[PDB]
């Protein structure tokens, strides 16, 4: 009334949404990949992005400290998600590698650990996925291709880097508690909000990192054997690696060097440590 | 508390006349961008609506880059913080006399193109970068380490993947127009708001992807020669390829197959036409 026009040059309407910083801090203990959690393993360390926070990273470092009091080293940004409660909440995830001084990855993602063959839980997951892919005929062919590429429903090799794609398919198929399907079906331990979605991106990032350049000095002690180096990468990838081919990748990437002490002990080169100190949190990558 | 305004920013890249070009608005002054709104189902779907409304140019797959936050002062006037979310997309450039203009990557980042040798502008950049590094002795040593690692002075040479880290250093040093330094110093064509920071992220992403697995079928025509593919990667990297190592890489990765047809080059010699084999197209499709 009294001319309240639609758009107005002297009026700017700004949309706001909740900004949540979420932390995926990973450590390797007893050849088991383990993630920092709060609320008795139901949530990741998280907190809102506030005015007093100088940066996103420094803001998350305060929440990690207040909620865990566990020191963290370098951080790298993962993925940014809109809520699926696309409305009110924007979540920003970060990955960190530390030495444990905690819950396991495969408590939340038991189907991702193939170190001792395929997990038998995958038979039930595939059975539910085939029923969902066959539920609507016009989308049957595409859903079978997605389920084959991710889980290998009608065959197809297992790709460990597709942790996120596998969790997104289970969510769309209503096979995880976070989807909240009418008959609730769930595999693995669920988490608060979409924290398992965040964790999936951290597992995918680490696995993609260790396949072409395993810069994991923060996960190891200062000295280690090459077989200890293989055991922890095998724990991260959820696969058993070939000895000969793993030795070639490490020497090819000039990552480690002999310390002279005794199997031979190795340490990551100082150049690898110095480059990481200057690379920041927005690393040049190929996927994320 | 914990609110933020999200701007979705698009880096849509095409390769025309062996030159990498980015889609822009306002006659090359800004990238296509728009706020994230409540009705936007996802961050990617929200940006697609801004791309269409502002350019009306078709866009294929989109890949999230990184999220940046503001360092402003009176964000409390806005009700929350301000963040920027970038996305990278590869398309074929299309003329249509909508309003949108295609500009080359290196109009904004001239120091990133080393195809014709190291550019001369880097001599003026390194000079002003040293003067900034020597201005404050307590931080001189650390600033020289950042200047050596980012701008090729390291000894390891020029790293084309560090496009964002180079630009961020130039911003902190007050060597770009977006810094608004007390004496204005700028290299390359500036952009609106922080969009040149977003473009540097997309350039770094593409260069890291093509180094490991150049899945660039969206940038190429349906069929192409191997020389056309090499010129495309070279334009993206700002470097000249090792021909034999590049041919060996795309064969090991099983990326392109012969179409059976022939093409006559400019000089007059015929050459086999290639296409990205279907398995490469299907893998990129089975995601998001
Ligand atoms: N708008 C901007 N455009 C370009 N560079 C910027 C901008 N704002 C800050 N920078 C620079 O970017 C660098 C990184 O700061 P930023 O606020 O992005 O987060 P950060 O946690 O310090 O990053 P990192 O530790 O990953 O380098 C700093 O050198 C800063 O001066
Ligand atoms: K919040
Ligand atoms: K950051
Ligand atoms: K502020
Ligand atoms: Na740069």
Q: Between B2, B282, B283, which is nearest A18 by CB?
A: B2
> Cβ contact (<8 Å) for B36 and A285?
no
> What was the elucidation method?
X-ray
**B62-69 and B101-104: which strand pairing?**
unpaired
The three-state secondary structure class of B158 is coil
Side-chain-side CA neighbours of B33 within 13 Å: the count stands at 22
Residue that is written with structure tokens 């090729």 in the block? B152
- Ligand 4 centroid, distance to A50 Cα (angstroms): 8
Residue that is written with structure tokens 């940006």 in the block? B47
> Cβ contact (<8 Å) for A79 and B66?
no
Closest to B102 measured CA to CA, from B197, B14, B232: B14
Q: How many DSSP H helices and E strands does chain B contain?
A: 9, 8
Q: What φ, ψ does residue B40 adopt, rounded to 5°?
A: -70, 115
The experimental resolution of this structure, in angstroms, equals 2.2
Closest to A159 measured CA to CA, from A127, A198, A109, A207: A207
Instruction: Tell me the fold of B4-106.
Output: Nucleoside Triphosphate Pyrophosphohydrolase (3.90.79)
Residue B251: its H or E element: helix B243-252
CB B133 within 8 A of CB B196: no
For residue B219, count other CB atoms closer than 10 A to its CB: 24
Instruction: Report residue A149 CA to chain centroid gap.
Output: 19
Give the contacts of B22 (CB within 8 A, at least 6 positions apart): B11, B12, B13, B31, B102, B103, B104, B105, B108, B199, B202
**B81-90 and B3-16: which strand pairing?**
parallel
The three-state secondary structure class of B138 is helix
The three-state secondary structure class of B49 is helix
**Length of chain B as a residue count:** 288
Q: Which residues of B139-172 are buried (b: 16+ CB within 10 A; e: fewer)?
A: eeeebebbbbbbbbbbeeeebbbbbbbbbbbbbe
For ligand 3, a single-atom ion, the residues with CB < 5 A are A 56-57, 77, 281
CATH number, domain A214-279: 1.10.10.10
Query: How many Å apart are CA B33 and CA B24, to the nearest integer?
Result: 10
Map out the domains of chain B as residue ranges: 4-106, 116-187, 213-285
For residue B118, count other CB atoms closer than 10 A to its CB: 12
Instruction: Tell me the fold of B213-285.
Output: Arc Repressor Mutant, subunit A (1.10.10)
Residue B54: its H or E element: helix B43-55
* Chain A: residue whose CA lies nearest to B209: A286
Query: How many Å apart are CA B217 and CA B61, to the nearest integer?
Result: 11
Query: How many Å apart are CA A95 and CA A281, to the nearest integer?
Result: 9
């Amino acid at each position: 009334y009294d001319d309240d026009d639609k758009d107005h040059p002297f009026t700017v309407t700004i949309g706001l949404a909740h900004a949540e910083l979420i932390a995926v801090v990973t450590a390797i203990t007893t050849d088991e990949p383990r993630v920092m959690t709060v609320r008795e393993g139901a949530a990741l360390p998280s907190g809102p992005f506030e005015f007093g926070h100088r940066t996103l990273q420094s803001g998350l470092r305060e929440w990690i400290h207040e909620q865990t009091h566990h020191p963290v080293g370098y951080l790298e940004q993962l993925y940014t998600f809109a809520d699926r409660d696309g409305g009110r909440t924007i979540s920003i995830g970060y990955l960190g590698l530390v030495r444990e001084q905690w819950h396991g990855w495969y408590e939340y993602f038991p189907w991702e650990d193939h170190r001792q063959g395929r997990p038998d839980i995958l038979d039930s997951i595939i059975d539910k996925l085939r029923a969902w892919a066959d539920s609507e005929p016009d989308s049957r062919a595409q859903r079978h291709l997605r389920a084959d590429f991710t889980f290998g429903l009608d065959g197809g090799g297992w790709n460990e880097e597709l942790t996120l794609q596998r969790y997104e398919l289970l969510y769309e198929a209503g096979l995880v508690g976070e989807a909240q399907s009418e008959p609730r079906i769930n595999f693995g331990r669920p988490m608060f909000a979409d924290h398992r979605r965040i964790l999936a991106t951290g597992i995918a990032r680490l696995r993609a990192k260790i396949k072409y350049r395993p810069v994991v000095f923060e996960l190891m002690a200062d000295s280690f054997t090459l077989l200890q180096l293989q055991r922890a990468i095998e724990a991260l990838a959820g696969l058993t690696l070939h000895k000969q081919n793993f030795r070639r990748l490490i020497e090819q990437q000039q990552l480690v060097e002999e310390t002279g002490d005794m199997a031979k002990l190795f340490r990551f080169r100082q150049t690898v440590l110095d480059e990481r100190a200057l690379s920041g949190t927005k690393l040049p990558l190929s996927r994320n």
